[PDB]
Design a protein around this ligand. Structure first.
Ligand SMILES: CCCCCCCCCCCCCCCC(=O)OC(CO)CO
Length: 135
């Protein structure tokens, strides 16, 4: 069922979110706040149509997309940049490339049973997050 990412996922680990944020030029005051936050991620998946919501005490980030359809992503409340984003399946891994000002920007998201993994990349920095399927 490795492509079914539907549900609510609760963060349990968040490695080098700081390195990823610094690569995006996030201001120090925001990084100092955001590096501690536990995140929740809600995915509404209907085949290749995705509606996702990543939430916290500090800020939320929503992004909707269709696999294989390049779209104009505006990273509101993150680094507030415009990127051309494409999400595709590479095996059972959901792979997004975000081309714009920053090089080697994207993410990879996949399921392992009751765990959701998300690797965020920007240039020289990789952030590794693990979420647990909501109890
Ligand atoms: C980082 C600057 C200040 C943060 C301030 C606090 C925000 C924490 C929650 C949102 C954090 C969201 C990070 C990117 C997630 C992403 O875009 O990938 C998703 C798209 O679908 C994969 O599910």
């Amino acid at each position: 069922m490795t492509r079914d990412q539907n549900g609510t996922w609760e963060m349990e680990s968040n490695e080098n979110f700081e390195g990823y944020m610094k690569a995006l030029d996030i201001d120090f005051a925001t990084r100092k706040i955001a590096v501690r936050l536990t995140q929740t991620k809600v995915i509404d998946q209907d085949g290749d149509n995705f509606k996702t919501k990543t939430t916290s005490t500090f800020r939320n980030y929503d992004v909707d997309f269709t696999v294989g359809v390049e779209f104009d992503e505006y990273t509101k409340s993150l680094d507030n940049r415009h990127v051309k984003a494409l999400v595709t399946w590479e095996g059972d891994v959901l792979v997004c490339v975000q081309k714009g000002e920053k090089e080697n920007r994207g993410w990879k998201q996949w399921i392992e049973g009751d765990k959701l993994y998300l690797e965020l990349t920007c240039g020289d920095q990789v952030c590794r997050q693990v979420f647990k399927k909501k109890l």
